[PDB]
């Protein structure tokens, strides 16, 4: 869900990476500076937060 939301919000110039740990995934989204608000807004609409 998170990937979809970010992808529509942030086009294809965002980087979504994840690495496991035994159970879920801690994920990191890497975005350009000044694209911070938009990036955040996308997480907030899914219900995921920082």
């Amino acid at each position: 869900l998170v990937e979809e939301a970010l992808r529509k919000a942030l086009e294809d110039r965002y980087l979504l990476a994840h690495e496991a740990y035994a159970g879920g995934v801690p994920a990191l989204v890497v975005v350009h500076r000044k694209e911070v608000d938009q990036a955040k807004a996308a997480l907030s609409r899914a219900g995921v937060a920082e």
Binding site: R13, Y14, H32, R33
Partner: protein, 62 residues
């Protein structure tokens, strides 16, 4: 792609800054020409003065 964004945040600053510093390197140099010219404008009047005074003195003296 994502690396093409990165080259555009830089490529923008490095023309803003280098356009600004080629107009200070213009500006100092414009004032430097306008000063040397004026320090010789005052030199031009001075010499004249000294010659107009000088000749009048020699006329009176004689």
């Amino acid at each position: 792609k994502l690396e093409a964004i990165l080259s555009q945040e830089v490529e923008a600053e490095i023309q803003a800054l280098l356009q600004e510093a080629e107009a200070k390197a213009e500006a100092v140099k414009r004032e430097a020409e306008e000063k040397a010219k004026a320090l010789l404008q005052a030199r031009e009047r001075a010499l004249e003065a000294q010659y107009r005074a000088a000749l009048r003195r020699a006329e009176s003296a004689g």
